[PDB]
C-alpha cells in the first residue's frame, strides 16, 4: 500500500569463494533495507545462491558427494559470511528449492505456451571434456580455458527463446525510463546493445550433459539452464503466482548488481519479464569493480587481493562496513585497501566518533554529576534534525557516501562545538551554560547516531548504550530536537571503537 521498499542481490555461484564483490553488493543492498526500515517502510531484502549446473555437478561427484548434500554444505559459506558482516536480510533463496522450482517451470510453461520457445540447433567450438561450448574470447586463444586443449566444432539441440522479439520494446522502454538503469553510465552503455540486434537465447541443454537443474516442463529430457533458472529467483521467493509477497513487493524491485552481470540484467532479464507477463522493475542499480591498492583489477596473479574478512577480523564488521560505503561512489571502479580502512577507522571512528563520546562521558560526570543534563536549545546544533531529509534523496539516488559524509560532518562539527565553548572553561562563569553545551553534544550524537546506524547497527547501538539513551530507534526521532533524556549514563562503558 504505501511505504514499500524491495532490494535484491545477485545470486552467487553456490561453489564460488564469497570475496569482496559479493561482500560489497550485500553490504550496500542491507544499508538500503537497513534504511528504509527505519524510515518506516514495510521492506523486503532478499539474496541467495546459484546452485545448478554441471560444474558444481561434477565438483560434488569429486568428493563422492551427492549434488544436493554437496550444495546444502558450500552455500552455508555464504551464510556464515552474511552473518559475519551483519547483514539482515528477509530471505536467502536457494535454487534447489521447490517453491523456486515450481516458479521456474511455471513461468517456462507460460512463454511456451505464447509461442516465445522453440527448439533448434546451437553449433560452435565445443570442449568435450568440458562438455561446453565457448567463443573466441572464452577459449584461451587456442585451446580450452579449463583444460588447455583445442576446441572442436560442433552442434547441440537446444530450445530457445525469441528474445530479439522483444528487442525494439525494451529499447524504447528504456528511453522513455531514463532512470531504470541507475548510474546513466551504464544507462548508455545498455542503450548502445539495444541499437543491434540481441539475438535469441538458449535457455536448455539435454540432461544427459547436464542432469544438474530444473528440467524443461514440457521437455523432461531437458534441463533449464541459467538464465530462466537464476534470474527467476526474484520473483520466486516472493511466491510469485499467488503469494501476497509477490502483490506487495514486485511493484518496487529494485536490483542491485555489478557491471559484470550487466546484459544478462538489462536485455535478458527485462524481456524475459515482458514475455511472462510480470511487469518489470523500478531500478537496475549497478556497481563498479573495487579495485586493488594498485588502482588495477583485484588479481592474485598482480598480488593486490583485499580479503574482506580479514580487514573484517581485525577492524570489526561496523568498521568495514562503513569504510565500504563511505570510501566508495556507487556505480565506480574504486581501489580499496587496508590502509585506507585503517586511516578512515583512526580518524572517522575512533577519533571523530568514539572519542567524543568518552571524552563527552568524562565531562558530564565531572561538569554535569554523571546524568544527561536538563533539555535546553540546540541553536547552532539544532540543524543536525534536517539532516534525515537531506541524506533520504541522497540514499535513494545511491549517494551512500556522501550521505555518510554529511551526517559525519554533524559529528565533527559536534566536536568543533565543544571544543569551542570549552565547557571546562564554562563551568568557572556560569555552568548552567556549561551544561547546555553538553546537552547539546549529547543530543547531537543521538541524532547522528540514528543516521549512521544502517551502515553500524550495533555499534550505533552501543554508543546510545554508553550515553544512556533509548536504544532502538526511528529515522524521524532524528528530525525532533530536545528528545534525550536527563537521566543518568552508564558508571561505565567500553571503548567504541578501541585502538587498532
Ligand atoms: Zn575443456
Request: aromatic share 12%; hydrophobic share 40%; glycine share 8%.
Given at each position: 500500500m504505501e511505504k514499500v521498499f524491495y532490494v535484491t542481490?545477485?545470486?552467487?555461484?553456490?561453489?564460488?569463494?564469497?570475496?569482496?564483490?559479493?561482500?560489497y553488493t550485500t553490504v550496500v543492498a542491507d544499508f538500503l533495507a537497513r534504511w528504509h526500515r527505519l524510515d518506516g517502510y514495510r521492506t523486503f531484502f532478499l539474496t541467495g545462491t546459484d546452485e545448478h549446473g554441471e560444474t558444481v555437478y561434477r565438483a560434488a561427484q569429486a568428493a563422492g558427494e551427492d549434488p544436493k548434500a554437496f550444495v546444502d554444505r558450500v552455500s552455508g559459506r555464504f551464510k556464515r559470511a552474511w552473518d559475519l558482516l551483519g547483514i539482515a536480510y528477509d530471505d536467502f533463496?536457494?535454487?534447489?528449492?521447490?517453491?523456486?522450482?515450481?516458479?521456474?517451470?511455471?513461468?517456462?510453461?507460460?512463454?511456451?505456451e505464447a509461442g516465445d520457445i522453440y527448439y533448434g540447433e546451437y553449433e560452435g567450438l565445443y570442449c568435450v571434456s568440458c562438455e561446453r561450448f565457448y567463443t573466441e574470447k572464452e577459449l584461451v586463444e587456442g585451446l580450452c580455458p579449463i583444460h588447455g586443449r583445442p576446441?572442436?566444432?560442433?552442434?547441440?539441440?537446444?530450445?530457445?527463446?525469441?528474445?530479439?522479439?522483444?528487442?525494439?520494446?525494451?529499447?524504447?522502454?528504456?528511453?522513455?525510463?531514463?532512470?531504470?538503469?541507475?548510474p546513466e553510465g551504464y544507462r548508455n552503455e545498455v542503450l548502445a546493445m539495444l541499437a543491434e540486434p540481441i539475438g535469441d537465447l538458449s535457455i536448455s541443454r539435454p540432461?544427459?550433459?547436464?542432469?544438474?537443474?530444473?528440467?524443461?516442463?514440457?521437455?523432461?529430457?531437458?534441463?533449464?539452464?541459467?538464465?530462466?533458472?537464476?534470474?527467476?529467483?526474484y520473483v520466486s521467493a516472493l511466491d510469485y503466482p499467488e503469494?501476497?509477497?509477490?502483490?506487495?513487493?514486485?511493484?518496487?524491485?529494485?536490483?542491485?548488481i555489478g557491471k559484470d552481470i550487466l546484459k544478462p540484467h538489462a536485455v535478458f532479464w527485462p524481456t524475459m519479464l515482458k514475455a511472462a507477463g510480470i511487469p518489470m522493475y523500478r531500478?537496475?542499480?549497478?556497481?563498479?569493480?573495487?579495485?586493488?591498492?594498485d588502482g588495477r583489477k583485484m588479481s592474485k596473479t598482480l598480488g593486490n587481493?583485499?580479503?574482506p574478512f580479514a580487514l573484517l577480523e581485525k577492524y570489526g564488521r561496523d568498521a568495514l562496513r562503513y569504510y565500504l560505503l563511505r570510501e566508495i561512489p556507487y556505480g565506480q571502479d574504486t581501489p580499496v585497501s587496508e590502509e585506507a580502512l585503517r586511516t578512515r577507522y583512526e580518524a572517522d571512528l575512533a577519533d571523530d566518533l568514539g572519542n567524543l563520546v568518552?571524552?563527552?562521558?568524562?565531562?558530564?560526570?565531572?561538569?554535569?554529576?554523571?546524568?544527561?543534563?536538563?533539555?535546553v536549545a540546540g541553536e547552532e546544533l539544532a540543524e543536525g534534525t534536517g539532516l534525515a531529509g537531506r541524506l533520504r534523496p541522497l540514499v535513494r539516488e545511491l549517494k551512500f557516501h556522501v550521505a555518510l559524509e554529511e551526517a559525519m560532518a554533524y559529528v565533527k562539527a559536534l566536536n568543533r562545538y565543544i571544543n569551542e565553548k570549552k565547557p571546562w572553561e564554562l563551568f568557572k562563569k556560569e555552568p548552567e551554560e556549561a551544561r547546555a553545551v553538553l546537552y547539546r553534544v549529547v543530543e547531537g550524537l543521538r541524532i547522528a547516531s540514528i543516521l549512521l546506524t544502517p551502515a553500524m547497527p550495533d555499534k550505533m547501538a552501543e554508543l546510545r548504550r554508553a550515553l544512556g539513551l533509548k536504544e532502538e530507534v526511528r529515522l524521524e526521532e532524528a528530525e525532533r530536537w530536545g528528545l534525550a533524556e536527563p537521566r543518568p549514563i552508564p558508571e561505565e562503558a567500553p571503548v567504541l571503537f578501541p585502538k587498532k
Amino acid at each position: 500500500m504505501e511505504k514499500v521498499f524491495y532490494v535484491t542481490t545477485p545470486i552467487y555461484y553456490v561453489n564460488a569463494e564469497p570475496h569482496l564483490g559479493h561482500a560489497y553488493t550485500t553490504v550496500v543492498a542491507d544499508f538500503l533495507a537497513r534504511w528504509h526500515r527505519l524510515d518506516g517502510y514495510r521492506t523486503f531484502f532478499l539474496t541467495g545462491t546459484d546452485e545448478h549446473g554441471e560444474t558444481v555437478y561434477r565438483a560434488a561427484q569429486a568428493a563422492g558427494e551427492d549434488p544436493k548434500a554437496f550444495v546444502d554444505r558450500v552455500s552455508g559459506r555464504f551464510k556464515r559470511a552474511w552473518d559475519l558482516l551483519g547483514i539482515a536480510y528477509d530471505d536467502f533463496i536457494r535454487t534447489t528449492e521447490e517453491r523456486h522450482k515450481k516458479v521456474v517451470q511455471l513461468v517456462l510453461k507460460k512463454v511456451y505456451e505464447a509461442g516465445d520457445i522453440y527448439y533448434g540447433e546451437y553449433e560452435g567450438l565445443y570442449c568435450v571434456s568440458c562438455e561446453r561450448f565457448y567463443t573466441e574470447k572464452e577459449l584461451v586463444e587456442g585451446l580450452c580455458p579449463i583444460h588447455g586443449r583445442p576446441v572442436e566444432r560442433r552442434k547441440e539441440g537446444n530450445y530457445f527463446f525469441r528474445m530479439e522479439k522483444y528487442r525494439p520494446w525494451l529499447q524504447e522502454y528504456i528511453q522513455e525510463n531514463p532512470d531504470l538503469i541507475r548510474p546513466e553510465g551504464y544507462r548508455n552503455e545498455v542503450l548502445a546493445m539495444l541499437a543491434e540486434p540481441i539475438g535469441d537465447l538458449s535457455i536448455s541443454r539435454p540432461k544427459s550433459r547436464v542432469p544438474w537443474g530444473i528440467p524443461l516442463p514440457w521437455d523432461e529430457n531437458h534441463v533449464t539452464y541459467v538464465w530462466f533458472d537464476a534470474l527467476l529467483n526474484y520473483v520466486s521467493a516472493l511466491d510469485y503466482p499467488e503469494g501476497e509477497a509477490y502483490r506487495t513487493f514486485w511493484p518496487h524491485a529494485w536490483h542491485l548488481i555489478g557491471k559484470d552481470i550487466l546484459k544478462p540484467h538489462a536485455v535478458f532479464w527485462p524481456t524475459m519479464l515482458k514475455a511472462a507477463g510480470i511487469p518489470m522493475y523500478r531500478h537496475l542499480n549497478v556497481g563498479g569493480f573495487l579495485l586493488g591498492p594498485d588502482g588495477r583489477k583485484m588479481s592474485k596473479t598482480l598480488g593486490n587481493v583485499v580479503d574482506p574478512f580479514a580487514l573484517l577480523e581485525k577492524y570489526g564488521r561496523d568498521a568495514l562496513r562503513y569504510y565500504l560505503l563511505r570510501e566508495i561512489p556507487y556505480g565506480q571502479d574504486t581501489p580499496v585497501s587496508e590502509e585506507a580502512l585503517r586511516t578512515r577507522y583512526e580518524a572517522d571512528l575512533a577519533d571523530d566518533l568514539g572519542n567524543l563520546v568518552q571524552r563527552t562521558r568524562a565531562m558530564l560526570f565531572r561538569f554535569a554529576e554523571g546524568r544527561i543534563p536538563e533539555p535546553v536549545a540546540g541553536e547552532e546544533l539544532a540543524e543536525g534534525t534536517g539532516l534525515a531529509g537531506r541524506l533520504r534523496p541522497l540514499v535513494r539516488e545511491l549517494k551512500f557516501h556522501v550521505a555518510l559524509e554529511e551526517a559525519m560532518a554533524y559529528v565533527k562539527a559536534l566536536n568543533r562545538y565543544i571544543n569551542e565553548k570549552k565547557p571546562w572553561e564554562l563551568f568557572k562563569k556560569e555552568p548552567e551554560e556549561a551544561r547546555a553545551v553538553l546537552y547539546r553534544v549529547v543530543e547531537g550524537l543521538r541524532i547522528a547516531s540514528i543516521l549512521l546506524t544502517p551502515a553500524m547497527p550495533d555499534k550505533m547501538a552501543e554508543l546510545r548504550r554508553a550515553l544512556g539513551l533509548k536504544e532502538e530507534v526511528r529515522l524521524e526521532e532524528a528530525e525532533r530536537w530536545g528528545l534525550a533524556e536527563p537521566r543518568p549514563i552508564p558508571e561505565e562503558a567500553p571503548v567504541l571503537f578501541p585502538k587498532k
